[PDB]
Amino acid sequence: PWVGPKKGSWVKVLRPESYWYQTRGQVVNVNQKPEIKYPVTVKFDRVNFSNVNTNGFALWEVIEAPAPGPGEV
Amino acid sequence: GFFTVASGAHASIFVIRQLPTSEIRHRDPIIGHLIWVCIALGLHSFGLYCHNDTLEALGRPEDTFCDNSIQLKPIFAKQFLGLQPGIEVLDGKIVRMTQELGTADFMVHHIHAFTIHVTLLILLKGVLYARNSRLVSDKLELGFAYPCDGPGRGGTCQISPWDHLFLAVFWMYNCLSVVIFHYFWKMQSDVWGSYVHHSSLTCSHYSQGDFSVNSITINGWLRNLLWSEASQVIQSYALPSICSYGFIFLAAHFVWAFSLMFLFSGRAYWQELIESILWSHHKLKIVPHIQPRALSISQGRAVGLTHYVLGGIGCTWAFIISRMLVLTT
Ligand code: CLA
Ligand code: CLA
Ligand code: CLA
Ligand SMILES: CC1=C(/C=C/C(C)=C/C=C/C(C)=C/C=C/C=C(C)/C=C/C=C(C)/C=C/C2=C(C)CCCC2(C)C)C(C)(C)CCC1
Ligand SMILES: CC1=C(C/C=C(\C)CCC[C@H](C)CCC[C@H](C)CCCC(C)C)C(=O)c2ccccc2C1=O
């Protein structure tokens, strides 16, 4: 079964040190291997200071959220 | 000055992009001796001025370097035109007059040499140490215009030829400002002016020939040149002719001061402030998708340098032009 969020669904990042903390991204993929500490892959339209668009998060660092509306990050 | 610093810049770029000449392989002696000559020149030339200031303040003019006191005669400054004695005049003005050199001219010329040599030192160091150095050995890989290599090895700030130019421009501006002040004051005091009646004329100069007596001290430069001759520009508001020059004087002071912002501050403070500000925009749903960023390090340096030079040049421009316009009319 799918351990993490569904592929393509929007997840709100809960990692305090993340550039996208409390903002939402799209789940690119989730690693089903139980040995992966940070399986979920989330991409965001806003590049961070290092011009990086995607990142890897653990199952406890992302929660399911609705897609951003107009003017929402 | 600007084109000389440009030549230094593009010499550095050529060294980065192409193979340098073999004089770069003993660069350490070259720059070491240039450093020594810069230090010795600055010490002697400027410390003569400082000695004059201190001794005159203490009340010992006999101990200062001047024509009446200990005098440094420019023996090598010899004539070559072989002109006839006298001056050339045209309708109440001195079109041509010989410039008489003394201790003040000696001191100011050696100040000129010192500043030229320090600017050359900065440019030559940037050119010769562009590819690599003892600090960082892959400066060629880093390129031409990079801010640093990191806080490591003590800190590698402004190791790039771009930053070497960024400093050589400051030094060129300093040199040219001193040159402009020397020319302006010397011409006003000893060359330009009117005359009052074989006929012998007593020449009334605009600055009253005070260069040879007051230029020997930094206080003399501050008082008789900046303060005394800023009367025209500083008091130009009511006058229709030069009110613009007075306003530009003020605005150039403002711009020069504003440059210090970028010259002293750093990227991270402004980036963090921008993020804190952007919090409110995001709160109110004002989301700029071209995400605001603080100016890069090199850009901040460039902006600071540009504003600094522009403000200084504007102040000098307005001051000299106001003085000349008022005096001649
Ligand atoms: C052991 C002491 C010593 C010695 C023998 C030298 C020797 C030299 N230095 Mg100097 N130098 C020293 C200390 C010393 N330095 C220190 C501590 C500094 C750091 C501020 C420098 C910074 C320095 C620079 C930046 C440069 C030199 C240069 C030179 C060379 C030319 C001479 C010159 O212009 O010096 C000028 C500088 C001096 C400090 C003079 C030498 C100091 C003497 C020996 C002091 C002896 C008396 C002392 C004050 C007694 C105090 C006693 C009290 C505390 C009880 C020469 C090889 C120049 C060079 O390389 O030219 C090619 C050069 O550009 N030096
Ligand atoms: C330190 C470097 C330096 C620099 C950049 C200048 C720059 C200038 N000097 Mg010179 N000058 C210097 C040293 C220097 N001087 C020294 C040490 C003295 C003796 C006190 C003088 C005495 C002097 C006079 C009297 C006059 C100038 C003038 C000038 C102008 C050039 C025209 C001229 O006649 O030059 C002449 C240049 C010299 C006489 C110096 C020769 C070059 C050096 C000193 C050779 C040393 C090398 C030696 C073989 C090895 C030394 C080893 C070391 C370990 C001790 C210009 C502003 C003229 C000017 O325009 O005045 C308004 C002028 O009238 N200078
Ligand atoms: C709050 C006080 C204040 C402040 C912060 C400033 C700030 C400034 N003034 Mg000043 N100014 C002030 C009060 C102040 N002024 C007052 C009360 C007046 C009277 C109305 C003036 C009149 C005035 C004039 C007329 C001018 C300035 C200049 C400037 C600018 C200097 C920029 C620079 O880098 O110079 C660098 C500093 C120097 C080049 C030194 C110049 C003065 C000394 C005494 C010359 C000594 C020469 C001697 C041969 C030794 C040289 C050594 C050499 C190695 C450098 C700057 C905006 C001048 C400028 O733009 O300079 C380029 C300029 O034109 N000011
Ligand atoms: C590129 C480069 C650069 C720059 C350079 C320059 C700036 C140069 C200049 C040059 C020059 C500008 C030169 C000139 C020369 C001159 C000459 C060579 C002349 C001489 C003279 C004579 C020889 C004379 C003599 C006399 C006498 C003494 C007396 C009487 C007689 C007679 C007149 C004969 C830099 C470093 C930045 C960087 C790297 C690269
Ligand atoms: C202030 C500052 C900033 C912040 C400055 C920024 C972001 C510049 C702002 C750019 C604006 C948006 C360009 C538009 C031009 C001006 C607003 C024009 C004003 C003209 C007046 C006459 C009204 C840096 O990012 C920085 C970085 C590195 C070293 C020093 C500094 C530095 O000093």
Q: What is the phi-psi region of residue B117: left when phi exceeds 0, alpha when psi lies from -120 to 50, beta otherwise?
A: alpha
DSSP state of A5: P
Nearest CA in chain A to B287: A71
The rounded Å distance from CA B72 to ligand 2 centre is 12
Q: Which residues, in sequence order, are bridge partners of residue A29?
A: A41
As a whole number of angstroms, the distance between CA A34 and CA A41 comes to 15
In single-letter form, the type of residue at position B149 comes to D
CB contact under 8 A, B285 and A45: no
3-state secondary structure of B65: strand
Query: The tokens of B178 are what?
Result: 């001193």
Query: The tokens of B13 are what?
Result: 């770029």
Residues with CB under 6 A from ligand 5: B 261-262, 265-267, 270, 294-295, 297, 300
The burial of B206, by beta-carbon neighbours within 10 Å (0-12 exposed, 13-18 middle, 19 or more buried), is given as middle
As a whole number of angstroms, the distance between CA B22 and CA B139 comes to 18
Task: Collect all residues with Cβ–Cβ distance below 8 Å to B264 and sequence separation of at least 6.
Answer: none
Which atom of ligand 3 approaches the CA of B314 most closely? Answer: 60
- Tracing tokens 């959220």 back to the chain, one arrives at A65
**DSSP codes, B71-102:** ----TT----S-PPSS-EESSSSEEE-PPPP-
3-state secondary structure of B184: helix
Which of B262-277 are b and which e, b meaning 16 or more Cβ less than 10 Å from the residue's Cβ? bbeeebeebeeeebee
CB contact under 8 A, B287 and A72: yes
Question: Which run of H or of E encompasses B56?
Answer: helix B27-58
Q: Which ligand is nearest to the CA of B31?
A: 1
Check if B36 has its Cβ closer than 6 Å to any atom of ligand 1.
Answer: yes
Which residue in B228, B231, B242, B209 sits closest to B321, CA to CA? B242
CB contact under 8 A, A46 and B286: no
DSSP state of B296: P
Give the sign of the dihedral formed by CA B16, CA B22, CA B24, CA B30. Answer: negative
Query: The tokens of B295 are what?
Result: 């100016």
Question: Which run of H or of E encompasses B29?
Answer: helix B27-58
Which atom of ligand 3 approaches the CA of B227 most closely? Answer: 19
CB-CB contact of B221 with B283 (8 Å): no
Q: How many Å lie between the alpha carbon of A34 and the closest alpha carbon of chain B?
A: 37
- Chain A interface includes B78 (CB < 8 A): no
Question: Which run of H or of E encompasses B140?
Answer: helix B139-142
Which residue in B244, B232, B251, B211 sits closest to B319, CA to CA? B232
As a whole number of angstroms, the distance between CA B52 and CA B107 comes to 11
How many angstroms is the resolution? Answer: 2.8
Task: Collect all residues with Cβ–Cβ distance below 8 Å to B209 and sequence separation of at least 6.
Answer: B189, B190
As a whole number of angstroms, the distance between CA B14 and CA B7 comes to 10
CB-CB contact of B311 with B252 (8 Å): yes
Which atom of ligand 5 approaches the CA of B292 most closely? Answer: 7
CA atoms within 13 A on the CB side of B137: 1
3-state secondary structure of B248: helix
Q: What is the phi-psi region of residue B288: left when phi exceeds 0, alpha when psi lies from -120 to 50, beta otherwise?
A: beta
Nearest CA in chain A to B278: A73
Which positions in chain A touch B285 (Cβ < 8 Å)? 70-72
As a whole number of angstroms, the distance between CA B261 and CA B257 comes to 8
Nearest CA in chain A to B294: A49
The greatest distance separating any two alpha carbons of chain A, rounded to the nearest whole angstrom, comes to 38
